[PDB]
């Protein structure tokens, strides 16, 4: 899986351990190997949510499977919880785009998964 | 909705009120409530379009509905117009990916929109 | 087409010619005209792959057509090869999301491609 979070929170306010925590928590939530979860945090961004520049986050999660109605609700609670606790971003100011990728449409290690 | 624009134009060229203008203009164009529109502008990027590094922009608009043939043409006219007038980017050096997202695939406020 | 590569490799380690090389190699592999290929490289990112901070990359390729099983395998070999040779990123630390975009969902030049 691939998880990206873009935010206007400053870099200094991203705690040590955050990328590793996202990796472990996503492995637990998706069942996917932590070795093959990629995480990316982009602080200091020029962004607004509802016209306001208070802390916010725009995110994505891509996976081959493990994406669906009930799972995505669970991931949203998990990820909003982490962003609130670690980055002090309110959950009402977080968006996450989920993508159920076809195995043929993900490149990795010189090939795909199909 | 979520609107992102990445560009090689420098930060100092982005007008102070650009995020607010995008929010208001997208609410009018999509009919979506302004308090749910998120906007993100990323200047100073290392990019090329046709192998040239003249001003360009790569963008995305995600929305649950309000995406379609005629609507997307209208959004492109609006958004290319703003990028041309505000950032001095030629419309023929702008790409916008439109995504009609399922509500179950958009996380927000500890859940999804489904 | 649109190709984006986000990486933790530092900016100074991106060679002169990298964007031009990507543009030309993508035109050859896809058959798409190079004047319409956009490329974007984002170095110095805070990202991890498998919890590790060794060089890695998270990428996307969007195209109207030219996306499919065998084609995407070919693009992955090409792009991992370039990232390995030019940015010193191991292929097993590269993910690429492929998107076959409907022409009506690609904005350009004040309109769309359909
Ligand atoms: C059992 N096993 C073993 C190795 C593995 C290795 C990789 C994956 C895997 C990777 N993605 C993914 C990553 C980035 C994207 O942008 C989209 C999808 N989805 N699944 N899954 C497995 C897996 O399920
Ligand atoms: C009538 N009504 C009322 C409330 C509302 C509230 C929210 C939305 C809404 C949110 N998205 C969206 C945001 C971020 C994404 O990354 C993708 C999609 N699309 N629509 N729509 C409505 C809406 O249409
Ligand atoms: C034959 N011919 C001629 C002109 C042309 C002109 C443009 C394209 C074209 C552009 N995209 C694209 C760009 C950015 C995106 O974000 C998504 C898709 N895909 N194809 N294709 C052609 C093409 O195939």
SS3 C84: helix
Rounded to the nearest angstrom, the gap between the alpha carbon of residue C108 and the centroid of all alpha carbons in its chain is: 19
Task: Look at the alpha carbons of A27, A28, A29, A33 in this order and tell me if their dihedral is positive or negative.
Answer: positive
Q: How far is CA C24 from the centre of its chain?
A: 12
Give the number of whichever ligand sits closest to the CA of residue C95.
1
Which strands sit side by side in the sheet containing B2-7, from one edge to the other?
A46-49, B38-42, B2-7, B57-63, B94-100, C106-108, C111-112
Give the span between the Cα atoms of B4 and A23, in whole angstroms.
25
What is the Cα–Cα distance from C83 to C51, expressed in whole angstroms?
20
Q: What is the resolution of this structure in A?
A: 1.2
Neighbours of B65 (CB within 10 A): 14
Experimental method: X-ray
Question: How many other C-beta atoms are found inside a 10 Å radius of the C-beta of residue B15?
Answer: 11
Burial A77-98 (b: 16+ CB within 10 A, else e): bbbbebbbebbebebebbbbbb
Query: What's the 3-state SS for chain A?
Result: CEEEEEECCCHHHCCCCHHHHHHHHHHHHHCCCHHHCEEEEECCCEEEECCECCCCEEEEEEECCCCCHHHHHHHHHHHHHHHHHHHCCCHHHEEEEEEECCHHHEEECCECCC
Distances (CA, A) of C13 to A19, B43, B72, C49, C73: 23, 21, 38, 19, 27
- In this structure, are residues B29 and B76 in contact, taking their beta carbons and an 8 Å threshold? no
> Cβ contacts (< 8 Å) between A56 and chain B: which residues?
38
Beta bridge partners of C26: none
Cα B20 from chain centroid (whole Å): 12
Give the angle subtended at the CA of B20 by the CAs of B18 and A89, to the nearest 5°. 110
Among candidates A86, A105, A106, A102, which has minimal Cα distance to A94? Answer: A86
Rounded distance between C-alpha atoms, residue B32 and residue A19, angstroms: 34
Option in C42, C111, C114 nearest B77 (CB): C111
Query: In the structure encoding, which two tokens stand for residue A113, read together?
Result: 């998964």
| Partner residue opposite A94 with nearest CB, options B23, B105, B108 | B108
Query: Is A10 considered catalytic here?
Result: no
* Phi then psi dihedrals of residue C49, to 5 deg: -130, 120
User: Measured between alpha carbons, how far is A38 from A1 in angstroms, rounded to an integer?
Assistant: 6
Is any ligand 1 atom within 6 A of the Cβ of residue A37?
no
Q: Which token pair is A106?
A: 């993900």
List, in sequence order, every residue forming a beta bridge with C3; answer none if it has no partner: C39, C61
Q: Which residue has the tokens 């929305």?
A: B63
Of C59, C42, C58, C60, the residue nearest C100 (C-alpha): C60
Tell me if B101 CB under 6 Å of ligand 2. yes
Tell me which residue of C60, C58, C64, C57 sits closest to C1, measured CA to CA. Answer: C64
* CA pair distance B60, B97, nearest whole angstrom: 5
Residues B95 and C110: their CA atoms lie apart, in Å, by 10
Q: What domains appear along chain B, each with residue ranges and CATH number?
A: 1-114 (3.30.429.10)
Cα(B46)–Cα(A23) distance, integer angstroms:
28
- How does DSSP assign C11-80, residue by residue? GGGSPTTHHHHHHHHHHHHH---GGG-EEEEE-S-EEEETTB-SS-EEEEEEESS--SHHHHHHHHHHHH
């Amino acid at each position: 899986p691939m998880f990206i979070v873009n935010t206007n929170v400053p870099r200094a306010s991203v705690p040590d351990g955050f990328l590793s925590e996202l990796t472990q928590q996503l492995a637990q939530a998706t069942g996917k190997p932590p070795q093959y979860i990629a995480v990316h945090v982009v602080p200091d961004q020029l962004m607004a949510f509802g016209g306001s520049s208070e802390p916010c986050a725009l995110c994505s999660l891509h996976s081959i499977g493990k994406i669906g109605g009930a799972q995505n609700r669970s991931y949203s609670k998990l990820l909003c919880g982490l962003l609130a606790e670690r980055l002090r971003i309110s959950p009402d100011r977080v968006y996450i785009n989920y993508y159920d990728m076809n195995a043929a449409n993900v490149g990795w290690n010189n090939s795909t998964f199909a």
